[PDB]
Amino acid sequence: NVNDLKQRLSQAGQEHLLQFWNELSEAQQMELYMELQAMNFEELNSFFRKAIGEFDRSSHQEKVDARMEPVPRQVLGSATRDQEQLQAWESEGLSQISQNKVAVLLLAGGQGTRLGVSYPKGMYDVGLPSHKTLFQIQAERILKLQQLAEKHHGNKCTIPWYIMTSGRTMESTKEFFTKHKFFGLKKENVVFFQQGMLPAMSFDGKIILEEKNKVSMAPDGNGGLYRALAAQNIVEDMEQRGICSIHVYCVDNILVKVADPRFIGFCIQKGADCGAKVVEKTNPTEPVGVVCRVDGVYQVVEYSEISLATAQRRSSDGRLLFNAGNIANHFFTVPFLKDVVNVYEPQLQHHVAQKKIPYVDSQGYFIKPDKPNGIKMEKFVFDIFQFAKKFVVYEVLREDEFSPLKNADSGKDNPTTARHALMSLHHCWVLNAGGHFIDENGSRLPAIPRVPIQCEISPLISYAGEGLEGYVADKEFHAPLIIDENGVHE
Amino acid sequence: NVNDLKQRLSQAGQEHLLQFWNELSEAQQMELYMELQAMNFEELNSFFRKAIGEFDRSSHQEKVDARMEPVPRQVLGSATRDQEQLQAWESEGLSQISQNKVAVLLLAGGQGTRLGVSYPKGMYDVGLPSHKTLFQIQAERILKLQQLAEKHHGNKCTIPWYIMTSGRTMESTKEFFTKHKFFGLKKENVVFFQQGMLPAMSFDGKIILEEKNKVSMAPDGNGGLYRALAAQNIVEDMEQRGICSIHVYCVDNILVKVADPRFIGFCIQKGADCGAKVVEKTNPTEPVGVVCRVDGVYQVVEYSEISLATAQRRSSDGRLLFNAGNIANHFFTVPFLKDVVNVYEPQLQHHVAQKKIPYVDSQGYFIKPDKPNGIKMEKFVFDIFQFAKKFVVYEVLREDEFSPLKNADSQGKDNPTTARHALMSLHHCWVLNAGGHFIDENGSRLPAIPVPIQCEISPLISYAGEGLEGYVADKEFHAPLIIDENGVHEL
Ligand SMILES: [Cl-]
Ligand SMILES: [Cl-]
Ligand SMILES: [Cl-]
Ligand SMILES: [Cl-]
Ligand SMILES: [Cl-]
Prior knowledge:
The structure is a homodimer. Chain A is α/β, with parallel strands linked by helices. The first copy, chain A, has 2 domains: 1-434, Spore Coat Polysaccharide Biosynthesis Protein SpsA, Chain A, CATH 3.90.550; 435-490, Seminal Fluid Protein  PDC-109 (Domain B) (Ribbon). The first copy, chain A, has 14 helices and 25 strands. An 8-stranded mixed β-sheet of chain A has the order 2-20-12-15-11-3-4-5, sandwiched between helices. Chain A has a 3-stranded antiparallel β-sheet with strand order 1-13-14, with no helix packed on it. In chain A, β24 (481-484) and β25 (487-489) form a beta hairpin. In chain A, α4 packs across α9 (261-269) and α7 (224-231) crosses α11 (334-344). Chain A binds chain B through residues 78, 80-81, 280, 282-287, 303-309, 311, 314, 316-318, 370-372, 398-399, 409, 411, 416, 424, 428, 431-432, 440-441, 446-450, and chain B through 78, 80-81, 280, 282-287, 303-309, 311-312, 314, 316-318, 370-372, 398-399, 411, 417, 421, 425, 429, 432-433, 441-442, 447-450. One chloride ion is lined by residues 475-476 of chain A.
């Protein structure tokens, strides 16, 4: 077993991964053996070879800035500037769901490390009055739409829920889901699968040991999505369920319209093989990727790749030229997703960033470098746009659809902001449905008072502000106001 | 003299302000008598009459949402959508400055109560590397323009600084300015004056006693600006200084472009007598009043007065219909302002608002009520757009021009970290746009968009991002980074 690993490491020029073999406890060494026997060394060498020949190849080419073109008018639909077309699209979305032809695919992360937390993000509770986690909010949205679809089409239906997770976080996410009785969905319609990993490598392409017996690993990027789908036969599953369309999104957006039937409807009606939802970027320095065309191909340019000039460029109308802010919310046809998984994905190389990788040295001290000593390779989910034959963009309102949980409260994209955004939305819903909020003396608060008016509507009651006139129309409320399966509460 | 008041308060139905007289230390009597003798009763009832013949009157009228139309495109200028125009407006601005035809008019408030401090906002150190106060940052923008305007027209020139402040904060602000030798400016060119004040009223227009010997007093709002100018002849002082244009602005915005020549230039070119700078409101629930017309009359509708429906209305272009977010930044002709002060402001009545006024009960006790018991009367700066013969509106970018200091440093917007970041980010950009570059510990350059990259440039060096090429073009820096009268420094 070990002289077959040896042979393979040698073939790959990675002999040094057993540097410390003769210093390990039998248990430590058949813990490291496991890790290595899993990896494919021939392939990783290829990945590295091809990826370096770009981080030093297109590195003698034009800065992306000059190759960049804005989204064409002809391609984008707008939640705002396309009125009561929304209706037609909503209906098309619910018809699709109704016929069991839609599924959601969730990029759950791994651990809430940036968050300061050991549990995966989305078991995070941002301190909503209901204190539901992101998982639960999202489950309830799936479930709400299976109710609203049955209401408008009379047929009982399901959105199967594919959830991708890091290998650390699987059994826990499963246990969390099992403990909560899948929040009312059926175990059968929740499918957990695991992201792959890539090792950190030296500039010279030597795989790096984090410890005498751990190789320095990290996820392969959001774009590891596709390789993971193949590995776990996720597509065969979707086909045998008879699924046509996948909504793809990330766990961290608390406002996320899971399986948004407007988006799905849009994309279905326009026969798109691929759509990306976006919010309008209005501040040049906003840390957000822009959807755009590079050398004529659709993709996202990350926010840390653009010149301040590019960012500050303004179209005729006063807006930013590159204003299609990417929120990691996508539509895929199954057929197009299947060709990306079985054909177009391998047809890619990895993105390469220089990283300061901590490693164990010859003498066994854990060093922490102060210049970068190696690279991480990542694939991005939005890299496949280039293969869409008919790609669309759908512009939504930030405050209705996007407020991500990225940081701890130590200034933006944190629990306070996420929470404030969901409560402001739901506040507005009540006003939009005829409701009013009222202070202790019972005189009514203005719609824009100024702490923040606390409001929370279970998704089971309203997916996106519908279904509330019965609860709130011409009634006044003292916040905190909650609306759930047992009605309103003050 | 003490008997006059009895009759004076009798002849206004305010006799109850001596309610506790017989109980007071006669030191407490001097105190109250002093407070009371200097007031114009009759005027205060008259205000309360004319201000209540309207908080009742509009009562039985259409809501403000049905009488609101946007600013017409013909009136609106824009830093984004209008280009070589900007260099043109700029140089007109400078020339006006350079012929000494320009003053500024600062609304400092009173104490930074909302901010959790006993001093006015002008003195707030948002915690920049230079630890400069707002007052300083502003003063030094007045100096820089003087220098810039002179390099561009020959003549040396001044931009007088009329500072309005609360009666409390006056002598603290003079002490502060003196402590700092007027930040570089001459003391002859800083002219301070005091905001007046109004007492709280019961719903019956009876003046309210906060304690046995204290009338419950408040500021008369920004709009007292006008009355405040008349009292201390501030108009004549400008007329005889030979000033034509006034840039009027409030103190709490760290990015404010004091006497901005672009905005002045626009207003002069368009021949406006009145101008409001504004920034694009894009989020319906942003608490920022909007400039617009109500019954075809120009004014500001405050964010607290509109329905959500109005806030969420949208023009064909996908933008908010009412997107002219008002940043308390205006341009006045003196003639106009002269007329506003002497003639038009007295024509107005006061805005009325129920409040919970701490008052003293006849059973001695000092009560802070839970229900609102009386009213504040106020006036606003923007109440007088309607009298302008030519109103104009100038849109600018938020990130360059507007970041206000409103709340104490929570984990919350519009506060010290916010303000601090906005100025840093702005200057960080100023550097990149002048060919500068930024560098980690190891020396590889870091992206235009990455704590935040700390960068502070003295108004002395650069007002709005000009003159940096001298210091930063094709050059690579390591932050924190200060550029300063005495060179660049990597701190
Ligand atoms: Cl192998
Ligand atoms: Cl839990
Ligand atoms: Cl809160
Ligand atoms: Cl009610
Ligand atoms: Cl009198």
